[PDB]
Amino acid sequence: GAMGSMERASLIQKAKLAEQAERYEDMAAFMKGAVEKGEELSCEERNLLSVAYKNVVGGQRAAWRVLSSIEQKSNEEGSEEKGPEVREYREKVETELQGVCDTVLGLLDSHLIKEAGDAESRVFYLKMKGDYYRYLAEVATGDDKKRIIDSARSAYQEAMDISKKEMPPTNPIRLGLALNFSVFHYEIANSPEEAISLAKTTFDEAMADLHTLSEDSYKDSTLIMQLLRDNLTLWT
Amino acid sequence: GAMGSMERASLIQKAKLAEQAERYEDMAAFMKGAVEKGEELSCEERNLLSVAYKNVVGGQRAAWRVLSSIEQKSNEEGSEEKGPEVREYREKVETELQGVCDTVLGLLDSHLIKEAGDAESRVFYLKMKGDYYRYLAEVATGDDKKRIIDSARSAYQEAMDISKKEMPPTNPIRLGLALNFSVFHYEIANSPEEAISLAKTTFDEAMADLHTLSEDSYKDSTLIMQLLRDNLTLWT
Amino acid sequence: VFXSFXXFK
Amino acid sequence: VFXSFXXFK
Ligand SMILES: [Cl-]
Ligand SMILES: [Cl-]
Ligand SMILES: [Mg+2]
Ligand SMILES: [Mg+2]
Ligand SMILES: [Mg+2]
Ligand SMILES: [Mg+2]
Ligand SMILES: [Mg+2]
Ligand SMILES: [Mg+2]
Ligand SMILES: [Mg+2]
Ligand SMILES: [Mg+2]
C-alpha cells in the first residue's frame, strides 16, 4: 500500500491535519494506512477512521441519490430519450461507492473486529459493519440484495446484544448504534414499527439513566437522544 | 486519455450531471476530455470548464491555506517541534494544486487560446490563464515566483486590452476580468492602489452603461458590480 | 435526508 | 477570503 513507508504516528497526525483541511479522501487513506500497520486502534483513532469514511461515502451517497433521481425521471411516461449517459454515470458513482464500502468492510474483517475484545471497540466496529452493509443495501438491486440486508442486520444485532450486556443505556456508541439500526429498520428492512419501537425504548431507557452522568457526559448523551426524538417526530 | 473513447456530446452531458451531483473532479475530467476532442467550445461549454476547475482548485486552495497557517504557527517562537509531517502534507496538497493549474494552463495553450478569435472566447480564456497563474503565484516561493507573477499579469493585461476595445463596460466577462485583475494587484502584486483604482473605474464605467441593458442583462451586470463594491469597501 | 449518527467526544 | 469571480448566465 502507498502508506506502507509512513510511520503509524505520522499517518495519525496527517489524518488529523486532513480533517482540519476538510480533505476527507486523504484522511481516509491515512487512516487505512494506520489500520494496515496491524496494531489495535485507540478510541480517538477509531473516531478518526469513522469520520473519514463517513464523509467520503457521504459525498458518494448524496451524488448517487441525485443521479438516481434524474435516472428515474428519465424513465417516466413522456420523458424524451437521452441515451445511456445518465445510467452510465450513476453506475460509475455506484461502483466507486461500493468500492469504498468494500474497503471499509475489508479493514473490519482484516483484522479489526477479530482483535477487538473490549465492548467499546467491538461494538464500535460491528456498528460500522452494519452501517457500510446498509450503504451497500441502499444501492443494491440484484440477487444478493437480501444477503446484503441480512449482513447489515446480523452485524447490528451482534452489536446490540453486546451493548445491552456491557454498556449503560446512555453510552453514546450504544445510542448511535440503536439510532442507526432503527434507520436500517425504517429505510432498508421495510419495518417502520420496529424502527419506532427501538427508537422509543432506546430514548426512554437513556432518559432514566441521565441522572448518573456528569455534565459533560450528559451533553454527549442528550445530543444523540435528540436525534432519536427527531426521527420519531418524522415517523409518527 | 481515459475520456478518449467517449463522445464529445456525452462528455458534455455528463459534465452537467456531475455539476448537479456536486462531483466537481468528475466534472473537470469530463470537460478536459471534451476540450481534448479538438473542437472549439461554445459559450455554455466554456462556462462548464471554468466552473469545474474553479471548484476543484478552490478546495485545494482552501486546504493549502489551512495547512500553511498550521505550518507557520509551528514556526513560531515557543512552538513545540512536531516533525516534518505538517510541511510534508502541505507540500502534497501544494503539488496537487500546481498539477491542476498546470493541466488547465495546458488546455488553454493546447489549443484553446490560439483557436479563439471572437472577443468573448479569447477574453474568457485569457482571464482563465491569468487566474490559474495567480493560483500558482499564491503558493510560489522560489526563483520563478517573479516569472509566475509576470505570466499572470501579461495574460490579464492582454485580456483587458481586448475587452476594452471589443466589449461594452457592462459585459459580465469584462467585469469579472477586471475584478480578478484587481484582486491580483491587491493580493499578488503588492499594488493596492492599482487594485482600488481599477475597481473604481470599472464600477463607474459600468454604472454609466446600465441604461442600455435589458432587465436580465442588468441583473447579470449589477451582480458583478456588487462584488467590485464589496472589495472597495474592504480595501478603503 | 440523513437520520443517522457516526467521532464521539 | 475570496473577492474574485469565475459560469455567466
Ligand atoms: Cl461515466
Ligand atoms: Cl503527505
Ligand atoms: Mg514505526
Ligand atoms: Mg417529446
Ligand atoms: Mg402501528
Ligand atoms: Mg426489542
Ligand atoms: Mg464523435
Ligand atoms: Mg514546550
Ligand atoms: Mg493612496
Ligand atoms: Mg488604467
How far from the centroid of its chain's Cα atoms is residue B65's Cα? 17
Buried b (16+ CB within 10 A) or exposed e, B29-45: bbbbbbbeeeeebeeeb
Nearest 5°: CA angle at A169, between A167 and A173? Answer: 65
A 4-33 residues inside an 8 A Cβ radius of B: 10, 13-14, 17-18, 20-23, 26
Give the span between the Cα atoms of B197 and B214, in whole angstroms.
Answer: 28
Q: What Cα–Cα distance (Å) separates residue A63 from each residue in A136, B53, B178?
A: 15, 18, 35
Binary contact (B67, A17; C-beta < 8 A): yes
Q: Does B171 touch chain D (CB under 8 A)?
A: no
Binary contact (C6, A54; C-beta < 8 A): yes
Measured over the CA atoms of residue A171, residue A173, residue A178 and residue A183, the dihedral's sign is positive
Give the span between the Cα atoms of B25 and B71, in whole angstroms.
Answer: 27
Residues 6+ away with beta carbon under 8 Å from B132:
B53, B57, B101, B104, B105, B108
Assigned C-alpha cell, A73: 425521471
Residue type, A100: V
The domain made up of A8-235 has a fold known as Delta-Endotoxin; domain 1 (1.20.190)
Of A194, A12, A217, A49, the residue nearest A129 (C-alpha)? A49
Q: Does B35 touch chain A (CB under 8 A)?
A: no
Nearest 5°: CA angle at D6, between D4 and D9? Answer: 125
Give the span between the Cα atoms of B101 and B57, in whole angstroms.
Answer: 8
List, as one string, the DSSP characters of A55-117: HHHHHHHHHHHHHHHHHHHHTSTTPPP--SHHHHHHHHHHHHHHHHHHHHHHHIIIIIHHH--
Assigned C-alpha cell, A148: 446484503
Give the span between the Cα atoms of B3 and A86, in whole angstroms.
Answer: 16
Nearest 5°: CA angle at B25, between B19 and B27? Answer: 40
Round to the nearest angstrom and report the end-to-end CA distance of chain A. Answer: 48
Residue A80 φ then ψ, to 5°: -70, 135
Number of H helices, E strands in chain D: 0, 0
**Spatial contact of A47 and C9, defined as CB atoms under 8 Å apart:** no
Q: A201 C-alpha to center of ligand 6: Å?
A: 8
Of A49, A185, A85, the residue nearest B13 (C-alpha)? A85
Domain ranges of chain B: 8-235
Instruction: Please tell me which of the candidates A173, A179, A183 has its beta carbon nearest to residue C8.
Output: A173
Nearest 5°: CA angle at A14, between A12 and A18? Answer: 120
Mutation target vs B (from A14, A73, A80, A85; most B CBs, 10 A cutoff): A85
Residue A197 φ then ψ, to 5°: -60, -45
Instruction: Please tell me which of the candidates A21, A26, A85 has its beta carbon nearest to residue B13.
Output: A85
- Reduced to 3 states (helix: H, G, I; strand: E, B; else coil), residue B187 is helix
Number of C-alpha atoms within 13 angstroms, CB side, residue A208?
A: 8
Q: Does B161 touch chain D (CB under 8 A)?
A: no
A 64-123 residues inside an 8 A Cβ radius of C: none
Q: Which residue has the cell 502507498?
A: A2
Binary contact (B227, D9; C-beta < 8 A): no
Binary contact (D4, B50; C-beta < 8 A): no
Chains C and B touch (3+ CB pairs under 8 A): no
Of A13, A104, A93, A11, the residue nearest A54 (C-alpha)? A104
Instruction: Please tell me which of the candidates B17, B67, B88 has its beta carbon nearest to residue A70.
Output: B17
CB atoms within 10 A of CB A161: 12
CA-based nearest distance C9→chain A, Å:
7
Q: Which chain A residues have a beta carbon less than 8 Å from that of C6? A: 50-51, 54, 131, 176, 180
Q: Does B168 touch chain D (CB under 8 A)?
A: no
**Spatial contact of B59 and B102, defined as CB atoms under 8 Å apart:** no
Give the span between the Cα atoms of A142 and A170, in whole angstroms.
Answer: 39
Chains A and C touch (3+ CB pairs under 8 A): yes
Mutation target vs C (from A180, A186, A202; most C CBs, 10 A cutoff): A180
**B146 class by beta-carbon count within 10 Å (0-12 exposed, 13-18 middle, 19+ buried):** exposed
Binary contact (A22, B86; C-beta < 8 A): no
Instruction: Give the total residue count for chain D.
Output: 9
Of B33, B24, B80, the residue nearest B52 (C-alpha)? B24
**Spatial contact of A47 and A27, defined as CB atoms under 8 Å apart:** no
Residue B209 φ then ψ, to 5°: -105, -5
Assigned C-alpha cell, B200: 473604481
Instruction: Please tell me which of the candidates C5, C7, C8 has its beta carbon nearest to residue A227.
Output: C5
List, as one string, the DSSP characters of A36-61: TT-SPPPHHHHHHHHHHHHHHHHHHH
Give the span between the Cα atoms of A206 and A198, in whole angstroms.
Answer: 12
